[model samples]
Target: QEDVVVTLSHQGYVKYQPLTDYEAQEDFIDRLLVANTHDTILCFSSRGRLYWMKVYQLPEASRGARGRPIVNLLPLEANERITAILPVREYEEGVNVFMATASGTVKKTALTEFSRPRSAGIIAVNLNDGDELIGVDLTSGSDEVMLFSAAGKVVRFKEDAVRAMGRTATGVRGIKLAGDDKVVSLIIPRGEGAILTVTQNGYGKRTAADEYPTKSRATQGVISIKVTERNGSVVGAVQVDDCDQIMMITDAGTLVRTRVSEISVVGRNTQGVILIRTAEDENVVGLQRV
Candidate 1:
């Protein structure tokens, strides 16, 4: 039962490598996890399907090896790509799988709903034609959820408000989005930590979680950050504590790791400070709490 580092790239390639020589690489990592070789993992695709695979079945390769494409391994359609990865040690009762979509939809399904696996993937959520799944997490059915949109708006609500649905059910609206706006990240707050917002132009800031008042679902959310021309649009958001660190990647492959304590925590309606000084042509793609 050795631990293996499962890695998936932005272009839908997947591999498992030894944790000893785990050097990060790819077309930029889209999703990654560390799990026992005997464990199973759930791959949530953009097309709203959940593909299950054993960690031991992933191609074991060196750090420099280009792994097998997921399309060849899973029965994924022409353009479906993996969006989220969850390591399942075992499926338990009372645990739920929370999912968020780009078009502002959110859904929760019981962990037991996915216990049964099929050779062909199962429908994880029913998405609109143009909508795609964005983020997914496990919850205890009593946690708080925050959905962050590209337009710098956020809606904080209780998980209990979203009733548990079946595997193939359509999600309810989590937030009301404006024209051209899309949800980029979903945070299941572990504590009353700070909400870190990062924009495409490299500006970012942290705001106290209390600044965002809890509201009901399907409402227009309050401003989490002021999205202006100088800051570009919001790219990603994560809940961070003072002891945590975050890693941000740019379109040009530039990556910056910054301490959570170093960033200034300001009001939710203000523009954020510069986290990374990206070039005029480059833009930040995403940020993850490391």
Candidate 2:
């Protein structure tokens, strides 16, 4: 099987390169996936819509080539941003597409609901005015869901807490937020690991995943980290293993790479140590496991 490394950037650029060539490399990459050239991936847009694209359709370019804009590949509006992409090998039963929005809404839709492709993207969730879709993942019926908000709150609950909904249905609230807080990350854990929380000012820390108790959806979550003037808001969170490494990208186009082992595990209520030491004018905007 021929595998290709698909790179999706924050600015909506998409491209693929052979696996061997990909070891080399960014418009501040938002995602990187290795999938078969014939596989299909669902593009989830910030507007709460979904579109389909085939792996072979992506422009095959050199390691340094700037990709073509995803807008030209998918029928996306000028105002919409592609936020998440899920590679699908088959549309089978028992597999659900779990989605989380910036406004704390969560939804689980069957994989079969999106088997059919359309030129005009279909609504994945009915979003509230000004809310945006931020995270999307495929989950088995029994997996657990964890959500982290910008204001340092985190909620972990079982997947069954959310009943499967139709493609166009608006989801129930996953976490309760005060003020302008919004959900910034979603983690559907397959096994135990540490939860890494990173803030906009380049501070980050890891806490045992189980320390954050499993709670019912829609309730206010416990603190995951202290968000303050120095640390800014939580920018991204992920479930990571000790062996894993992470990539942090700043709004000013700076990138920092560090190993998960380097970060000490701390209590959820504590502020994190400096992970990137971002400049006064720069703030972290994207993070991904390397």
Candidate 3:
């Protein structure tokens, strides 16, 4: 019979044995971005540096050699206090790249030289067969949310009563896109607690005629909004409440109970237990499940 496994530890070195024989040769790996294939690991340092290494099922026969990185964060100027990084998928072409900075700026260098207000929150959705890039900007005092094309043209702009207050107050704390290019933006009040939704079209320019207020909810410091999709339509929305609780709302306008402690959105489902950090952090010694 196979020996039963018991305790696991690093013998004065960072190594994954018995579980998987991959040994990371680089030291001080801060952030990690796992490739779509799941065999490569991208490591980012604290100072915005990056390294790429090949992960093997077993420790490489040679210990010192490492594969050349596909891309480096330091040289690309991608390390200026990056808050978020999301990969954009193009239906006809493939996956595109985007990064959000601490200065409240969203930049898309692959499609066009489009850069928009870097509010504390941002979400990118491809409307119209992944041909356009819709950016929801919730940080403006007007609670202004603008949609742009892949070529960097303003397609739509919208604001509502709550969003207007959010602009000057806490701004847009949450945003997501439903089917048919429908956008849902959550605006948070400054001192008092309230949540509002600023809805707009995913295409066309914003005008006085295009702005409207659609929904409102009461909550404290609503930080993020993630769309729950099923069969290509948004059936529900997950709202992060002040880093403390999470609330789920259905498209049928049903509220599912009231609260959760921690929440994370992976693909379309909401997770409660996993703690996901940026691809850069030194304490992460090695990659987990990527």
Candidate 4:
């Protein structure tokens, strides 16, 4: 039997290996930032209006993979301007529901005209459930936070809930939920060189009040504040100075550094993960794992 096993080589031979030939190339698109990468889904937002949102299946990159991971832009909607987007739940197969706010209202699109009191400022939140909207109001001194259901029932947080910090002239710099759903923080610019932290139900006092200087005209007013987390735990906080410098706080209760610039916008994800988007590349240049 062993001797009978002879080479089947002939003048014409055809071999087919489907495994090696089916490898797909990496897909990387230019001018797209990684908006959120968690639970296997990578979310990105473009500088110009990206009418639809995309989700790509990314192959796991080994330690030293060259270039960024390839992403396929799966257009979710055609002619819809996605101003802000957040994943409602953990990544799953099939269509995932996302909360998107557009520049203008669209009829029959399940969106309402959201305006803050006195037209101060508006920030969009993609609640875990598809049929709801959350609005933060910073026009009044109170800086109320509101929640609207899919049916358009607007409900504001109790009046004594949270106070607005910083200066009113600059309006509300930023507002994001901290800790659990019960906690929220607001950044207000007070004059040329001061910022204040007003908390609702004592949550702000423990997180931000002590770290920031008390009413100092030296820091120039807090332009923006963002909460940072790691592995689902609150590890640090980032504060944007008047000069646009970003200050980061580590989990060990230590200040990472000061006078660092490079943050354009900061917000919170549905899982409470902090999202920081920078116009300058150097911000994430050294962080390879990001």
Q: Estimate each model's TM-score.
A: 0.91, 0.95, 0.23, 0.22
Off by over 4 Å in 3: 1-38, 57-93, 109-290
Q: How big is the positional error of residue 87 in model 4, measured in Å on the Cα after superposition?
A: 5.4
Q: How close is candidate 2 to the true structure, as a TM-score?
A: 0.95
Instruction: Kindly list the per-residue Cα lDDT of model 4 for residues 27-80, writing each as its tens digit.
Output: 111111222222122222222221222222223232223322222223323322
Backbone collision tally, model 4: 5
Summing lDDT over every window of 10 consecutive residues in candidate 2, give the lowest-scoring window.
21-30
Q: Report the error of model 2 at residue 223, Å.
A: 0.9
Q: Which candidate is the best by TM-score?
A: 2
Per-residue lDDT tens digits of candidate 1, residues 216-253?
Answer: 88999999999999999999998898999888888888
lDDT of model 1 at position 3: 74
Instruction: State the local distance difference test value for candidate 1.
Output: 0.89
Backbone clash numbers for all candidates listed: 0, 0, 14, 5
Q: What is the C-alpha lDDT of each candidate?
A: 0.89, 0.89, 0.23, 0.22
